[PDB]
Design an enzyme around this catalytic site. Sequence first.
Site, short mmCIF file in Angstrom:
data_model
loop_
_atom_site.label_atom_id
_atom_site.label_comp_id
_atom_site.label_asym_id
_atom_site.label_seq_id
_atom_site.Cartn_x
_atom_site.Cartn_y
_atom_site.Cartn_z
N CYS A 70 0.82 -1.24 0.00
CA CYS A 70 0.00 0.00 0.00
C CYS A 70 0.83 1.26 0.00
O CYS A 70 1.53 1.59 0.99
CB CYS A 70 -1.03 0.07 1.17
SG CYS A 70 -2.02 1.63 1.30
N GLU A 114 -4.51 3.78 -11.11
CA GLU A 114 -5.31 2.58 -10.93
C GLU A 114 -6.45 2.54 -11.97
O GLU A 114 -6.73 1.50 -12.55
CB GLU A 114 -5.90 2.52 -9.55
CG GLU A 114 -4.92 2.54 -8.37
CD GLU A 114 -5.68 2.34 -7.05
OE1 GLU A 114 -6.14 1.18 -6.81
OE2 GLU A 114 -5.81 3.31 -6.25
N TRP A 143 -9.51 6.15 -1.24
CA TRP A 143 -9.68 6.84 -2.49
C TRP A 143 -8.62 6.38 -3.46
O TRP A 143 -7.72 5.62 -3.12
CB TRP A 143 -9.62 8.35 -2.30
CG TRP A 143 -8.41 8.87 -1.59
CD1 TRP A 143 -7.14 9.11 -2.13
CD2 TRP A 143 -8.31 9.33 -0.18
NE1 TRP A 143 -6.31 9.66 -1.18
CE2 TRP A 143 -6.95 9.81 0.00
CE3 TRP A 143 -9.19 9.39 0.89
CZ2 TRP A 143 -6.50 10.31 1.21
CZ3 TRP A 143 -8.73 9.89 2.10
CH2 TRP A 143 -7.42 10.35 2.26
N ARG A 180 -0.24 4.53 2.86
CA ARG A 180 -0.16 4.36 4.30
C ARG A 180 0.20 5.62 5.10
O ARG A 180 0.10 5.59 6.31
CB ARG A 180 0.73 3.19 4.71
CG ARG A 180 0.27 1.84 4.15
CD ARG A 180 1.26 0.77 4.52
NE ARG A 180 2.37 0.74 3.57
CZ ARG A 180 3.47 0.05 3.79
NH1 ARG A 180 3.56 -0.64 4.93
NH2 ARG A 180 4.45 0.02 2.89
#
Lengths: 407, 411
Positions: free
Chosen positions: B108, B285, B280, B111
Amino acid sequence: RFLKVKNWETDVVLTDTLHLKSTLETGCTEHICMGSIMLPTKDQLFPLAKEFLDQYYSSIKRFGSKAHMDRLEEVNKEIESTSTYQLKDTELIYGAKHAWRNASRCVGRIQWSKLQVFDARDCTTAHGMFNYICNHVKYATNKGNLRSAITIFPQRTDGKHDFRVWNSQLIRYAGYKQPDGSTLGDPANVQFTEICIQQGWKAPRGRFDVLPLLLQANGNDPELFQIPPELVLEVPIRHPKFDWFKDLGLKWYGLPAVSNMLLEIGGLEFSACPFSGWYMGTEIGVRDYCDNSRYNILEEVAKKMDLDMRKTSSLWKDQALVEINIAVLYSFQSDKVTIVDHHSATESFIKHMENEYRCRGGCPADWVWIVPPMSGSITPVFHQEMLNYRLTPSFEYQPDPWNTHVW
Amino acid sequence: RFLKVKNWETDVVLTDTLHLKSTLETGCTEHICMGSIMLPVRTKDQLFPLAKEFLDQYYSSIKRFGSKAHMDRLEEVNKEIESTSTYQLKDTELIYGAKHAWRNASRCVGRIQWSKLQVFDARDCTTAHGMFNYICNHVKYATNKGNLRSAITIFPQRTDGKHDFRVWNSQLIRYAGYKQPDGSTLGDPANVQFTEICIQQGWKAPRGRFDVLPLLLQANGNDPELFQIPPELVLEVPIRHPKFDWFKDLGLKWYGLPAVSNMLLEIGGLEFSACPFSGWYMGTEIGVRDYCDNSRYNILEEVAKKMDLDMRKTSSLWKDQALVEINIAVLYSFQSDKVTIVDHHSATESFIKHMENEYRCRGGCPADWVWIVPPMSGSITPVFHQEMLNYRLTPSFEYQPDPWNTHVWKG
Ligand code: HEM
Ligand code: HEM
Ligand SMILES: N=C(Nc1cccc(CCNCc2cccc(NC(=N)c3cccs3)c2)c1)c1cccs1
Ligand SMILES: N=C(Nc1cccc(CCNCc2cccc(NC(=N)c3cccs3)c2)c1)c1cccs1
Ligand SMILES: C[C@H](O)[C@H](O)[C@H]1CNc2nc(N)[nH]c(=O)c2N1
Ligand SMILES: C[C@H](O)[C@H](O)[C@H]1CNc2nc(N)[nH]c(=O)c2N1
Ligand SMILES: [Zn+2]
């Protein structure tokens, strides 16, 4: 022990068996993955020699022949006597080709078997080395129609008698710090540049000054040689639509030729083994030009394009990055110097992986290095699972000679 | 033992000791690195060590380690395990657990935000209609009219593995995929299989290119039930480009709320198999992966036609050009509509600062380079140049098999 790798874009699944023949260690453990770190005796030698000859004689389909055993004993006697041995020409060519084959970070191994090996084990002086290196450059450049080649100097002996090319590549540009504060030329080569100036080089102090070769034979102090300029093929960088592009003043050399690696074959170490092939376009357009600590030119290009630079979300860095790379490719093609684009190179490498999985039972591959530094996910390598492992023969890194050498 | 990582653009060297607290296994050996491989009841015996270790972590973070209240909690969980076979988390320890799982998520890039997480406790939930209500509130709360807020909803933990709570969808909001008989796909190729499960189960498919899938919800090990999210709750953004006027005519849109619903949250030995979380989107992506993978919407060709690029040779970089335009278009649409989104320059730079902070306060930051680096413009983002150490800490999020391959149908 039998491992599967999957391409997530096509669902092609390959089984790896080749990794069980791995010798060296990775940096990783069951507790920590290290896959992103950049650099993670008589008794010793004979095993290493035997492992190598076993694969050699198997590759020519003579495993367990007289000639196999006989060679194994002859080398065995050589070591037990001299505490070393010599490779035959045939074994040398095979060792070199397979070192490239096992290069898990090399995206262009589809070419691994078309490698011209120049044997320079008879060399004794820097002048001798300069001579072989020029014939290598001339040969590999081939007026723009680049050909893969490696030149191999004498192997390590006692370790105080080592042949080294101090340069990281045969052909690189100089790096100069300024009173001004910043760097003129390639900031990556500032330290080597001062070792040349501090050795005797008269530097032209320009942005694109080809560096002189710093060559060390038999553990002696290294000596300077300018490569005949007529041998260094260079490309002016222009754009197929941007007329102002050429006025940025950019050029690059056609021949990438790595000179600071150590080639290990059957336990024998070849500390000077410059090799060359040709460029993937992104190496220059993305890395050499746009890295913050290289020529770092994005800021200046984006200006000429008159893009909105007030916010990262305009993707102006990205827009400028593409055009720079379009222009590198265009220039090299227009001047007829071999280059490959990242789409073509990666597509090739996937075809190579598929060959090696069926011919050899696998293909060591380092995903962090294979995936291009731009447009990752739109090239097929992005979706391809890879297994990274270390096979011999191999190229290896080695300490910068100036930390080791004594004067 | 200490471990340094180097950033090759700044030469910043950082030291990792946190990996010393790592227990789970990486998949790699001293002989092989598996770094790019996509996929990595408990007895009472295995359970109390996992409990004790988790509550030492909890009590240290609150500066109560060794306290009367820490010991009493240990003994209480000890006895509750040895009598009821499992145990229940306090609200505070669940909050702390869920936040840590995010913080320990090495793939991730988001973070920096870990400590800001709304946790909804749905551990009193019993039925699928109950899950639907929890999920709606979550979707409404996180959406917040475009000003996205991170949140996670946590349904009851696994007990015997026969009474599992699952959300069958991979994300709460996602478009149908329809394989046509000519072999082409309508809608989103990655959801074809899930879509067919929905049809089979009673769903009336509108059969368009952007149809929001129903929720398929399993409570307490029962067969899953279908529920349609109220469309008023589904924020969507039509996609246009600041300079390309034909861009809108491609007919694209995307939803604003990415909310992952198929992962398992493991806290102190306990397994929460339904635990939808949402944040979000990073722009790539949608712009790179969702629109431009060959196995997804695959719009590259059609965009390149419209920009009249040379498409006869890949060396024209027509793909790379189109991809940038699509990505500018996505960020543009979201910002103009006031829906939170982050570009990959900004996200990766935030991540580098977070990672440095984490080395200082915590002694490390497990991170997965293969995932952290964006799928475009890799080397012009500062993470490309960052060496990173990947290892597994609990609490953590984990993959689990899709429920249709494991579920025992009742009828
Ligand atoms: C045919 C043309 C070739 C192309 C297009 C090619 C492509 C590349 C590229 C793009 C890299 C990564 C470079 C970087 O990012 O620094 C690389 C790595 C490598 N290549 Fe190839 N290559 C070619 C020929 C060869 C040949 C002929 C050899 C050896 C005989 C070779 C051995 C290696 C090694 C050892 C590495 C990794 C170096 C390291 O670990 O730092 N390459 N190659
Ligand atoms: C705040 C907004 C957020 C952004 C921009 C963000 C960014 C991302 C991105 C870009 C990925 C890679 C996903 C992929 O390629 O499929 C990812 C992975 C992940 N994120 Fe975050 N994230 C955010 C919030 C969170 C939250 C709130 C959690 C949990 C509470 C979380 C946990 C994870 C986990 C567990 C993965 C790995 C997914 C996998 O292994 O498949 N993210 N995140
Ligand atoms: N110190 C740096 N980078 C760094 C530090 C150590 C080693 C390397 C790897 C560079 N290797 C050169 C190389 C090696 C192999 C192949 C190529 N490229 C080629 N196309 C070929 C060369 C020879 C045959 S093909 C280049 C890069 C940085 C500067 C700015 C940001 S990071
Ligand atoms: N099955 C596939 N890929 C695949 C297989 C397994 C796992 C994943 C990762 C997908 N993850 C979705 C995800 C996970 C976590 C965060 C996000 N993004 C977000 N911004 C957030 C979601 C929730 C909170 S933040 C997306 C992808 C493929 C289809 C076509 C080619 S590969
Ligand atoms: C830290 C990280 O390992 C480093 O930036 C790597 C990433 N991938 C790379 N890939 C290639 N081909 N060449 C490189 O120099 C690098 N650098
Ligand atoms: C094979 C490979 O590991 C796989 O394609 C990975 C690469 N990196 C990724 N990185 C992110 N963020 N998301 C992904 O889905 C992937 N896919
Ligand atoms: Zn590893």
